[PDB]
């Protein structure tokens, strides 16, 4: 209804909370807004989390509607030992 989705966000078992949660979100926002809103909702670092949607990898530069997100779509939340860009630089430096 009213152009919103009740996304089923699945937190990792390490964070002792509910395994599956319901988040009331919109669809015109982008993947960066998506990860930021999960981080603020469930108390995580935005740069230390990876979000998995609708059996596809999140396109942070592309909005939710154009990457396939819809109503009642699951959202895996994966903790990062090192931030995405930080891990990229850290590992790619060692050669």
């Amino acid at each position: 209804t009213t152009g919103i989705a009740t996304i089923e966000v699945f937190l990792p078992p390490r964070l002792k909370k509910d395994r599956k949660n319901l988040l009331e979100t919109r669809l015109h926002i982008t993947g960066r807004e998506l990860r930021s809103k999960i981080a603020e909702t469930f108390g995580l670092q935005e740069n230390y989390i990876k979000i998995v949607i609708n059996k596809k990898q999140l396109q942070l530069g592309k909005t939710l509607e154009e990457q396939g997100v819809a109503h009642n779509v699951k959202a895996m939340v994966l903790e990062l030992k090192q931030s995405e860009e930080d891990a990229r630089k850290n590992f790619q430096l060692e050669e």
Partner: protein, 842 residues
Amino acid sequence: ELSEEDKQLQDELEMLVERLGEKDTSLYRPALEELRRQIRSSTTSMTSVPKPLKFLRPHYGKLKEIYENMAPGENKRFAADIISVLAMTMSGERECLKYRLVGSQEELASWGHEYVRHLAGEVAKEWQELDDAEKVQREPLLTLVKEIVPYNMAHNAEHEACDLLMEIEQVDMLEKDIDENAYAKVCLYLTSCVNYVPEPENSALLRCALGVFRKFSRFPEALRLALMLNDMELVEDIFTSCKDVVVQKQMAFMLGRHGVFLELSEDVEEYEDLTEIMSNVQLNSNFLALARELDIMEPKVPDDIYKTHLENNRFGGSGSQVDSARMNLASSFVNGFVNAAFGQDKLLTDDGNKWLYKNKDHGMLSAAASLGMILLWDVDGGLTQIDKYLYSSEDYIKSGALLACGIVNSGVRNECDPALALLSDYVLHNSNTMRLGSIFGLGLAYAGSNREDVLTLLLPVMGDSKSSMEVAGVTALACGMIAVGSCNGDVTSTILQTIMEKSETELKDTYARWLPLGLGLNHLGKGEAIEAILAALEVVSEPFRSFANTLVDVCAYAGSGNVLKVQQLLHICSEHFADMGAHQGVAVLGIALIAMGEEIGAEMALRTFGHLLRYGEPTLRRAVPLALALISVSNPRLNILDTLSKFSHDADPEVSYNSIFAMGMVGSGTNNARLAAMLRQLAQYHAKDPNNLFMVRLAQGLTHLGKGTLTLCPYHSDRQLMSQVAVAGLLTVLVSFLDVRNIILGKSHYVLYGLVAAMQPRMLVTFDEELRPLPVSVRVGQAVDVVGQAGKPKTITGFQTHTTPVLLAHGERAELATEEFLPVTPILEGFVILRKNPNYDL
């Protein structure tokens, strides 16, 4: 000689039979009445010798002709009864049958148990002697059965009833005739007889037992027989029919153990709990509890596993300071497999990059896969560590990380499906290594899924001419093991088109052996639909035509026990003529996989393999150890280990390699100290050859898998329940191992990780109705049936008292020593739920 009573009775019988000479009116009624009375009195008694039958040795020819001419009414029927009883002792099979057939009906119960059994045997003989040329004789025999079966049911003679009903090929009456106190006996009889009866009667018997169990509402057993039949519609029917939520949870546990994931509609209450149980997300946690019960949290290191402190250091401080790549790969496999599924390692978790940096190309892939394989059944926990190594500098090892994902998602499923999302953008990668890693991770993560979306996504890879041969082979095996035992027409047609368009020069490579694999992996346990498959494969030319035909023949009859197929395979093996011996090797593996269905067939396959070894040509000698490994996976039988130890010193390198892998597979996870000592001795003896050392260290890792708490058995439910995913995994590993140097010792170490697809644990974790762990005293011992067909659960002896969770070695079962709890599933395997006993009073 006779006695006074015997002589008088003989004289009376002779007088009665001699009075029938003429046609006097007061002869046929009196004489036949007297004969009927005496015969009924003697037969309807104890098993004492039927004295009238012993005395009576006349000829019925005059009796038969007079039967023909006298009294078209009941007197000829009396004569028929008398001659039938007489000929039951003699050999008058057809005549003795038709006397009861057309003579006085009365009832078979009025004669005796032995008469009923003899009539049943004669009826079976006639039915086997009667073809479809005429059904006139079938109906009265069916009417005879209508009364024979209830007699056996009421007189505990279910043996003869079941046998007769199998001879007539009709088993419907068991649905309406089985009682409450006898359903277990007949059900066990059928579930034991199904293995040895050939096609197609086994499937009919299985569905008959399924219907019986549904009628008596033994739902877990119905699920077991449904997975035996391997048909989803009846599984769904049983799932709908399950009105007890505890039985629903139990059947979810067994479905997760078998790896069958059926979509559940929202109409069923407690859908989320059943779905999460079937996804098997809890298992790892329980495993952790398992480990913390045994104080085996601390992971091991390859140095202590090899026990270098005991090996004779003939060269000290000068010959061990060089770290070759291959020994590093072996140490990776060890410091993986040994410490796998414990959630921690002391060398790959705190010193990851430093370890991986001393590996080259293939070592990168192997170590990246082992990083995920050091933590099993923790999708989020595994990926939290796998992501950084996915972000590695050497992006070529990215594919390895995907294997880690595919090896972490193995045995579990998530709603968000991290594996599908992670590999959807990487399957189409143009790099051969990238696509290889993507497809392998997707296959390992989705073993037995049969999901149409993943299959459709995997379809374009086969038609891609750019895709390399090893990419095509891995794609075919992944497609086959995602669609295990389904005969998917889409995958079958795709693989058939791919092999048809393939050229002979490109087919000559080893990886082309993986093209039938997936095709065969599509047809596990279903030999009926393979006539069309062999007809289609006949188009391609020999020798690969015969190779593919043999491989699909193996895959069709996986555990079937069809001795005719084994005879064809043995004929293939015995034909003494490189690629020509591949047919014989595949046929040897075929004898193995067909015979592993039955314990008797397997143990005779042992003797056949011994004869093949001591009297076969080099290719057969190389092939046999793989077959021996297939026969007794995670079953450290000492005779098998002794033969493999004898042949580990053979002058043929391939034979020794296969024997070492057979040690690794057969003794996998048993933590056999004798096997560990023999493997250490083999490592000491083979200290020079890198390949022998690598494979012996791999065998040590396999035998120390999970510190002795992991098994690769493709069998469950008292070894009666086959596992399609596990069978597929061992099949891929073994057929790849048919060429150890090019595949295993070449560029394809990752194929070994297919065994993790078969990686299944053993515990005795006991849950309450709410799924909390519950410690229950358990009597554990060997399941050696001290009875015959009494229906007993093998009457577990060799008792030992344990507190759950417990570790059960292969071939040793468990039972509940406490009456305080009742298990929903009487087969105490894996995770079980115990209902508190309402009958027990304090």
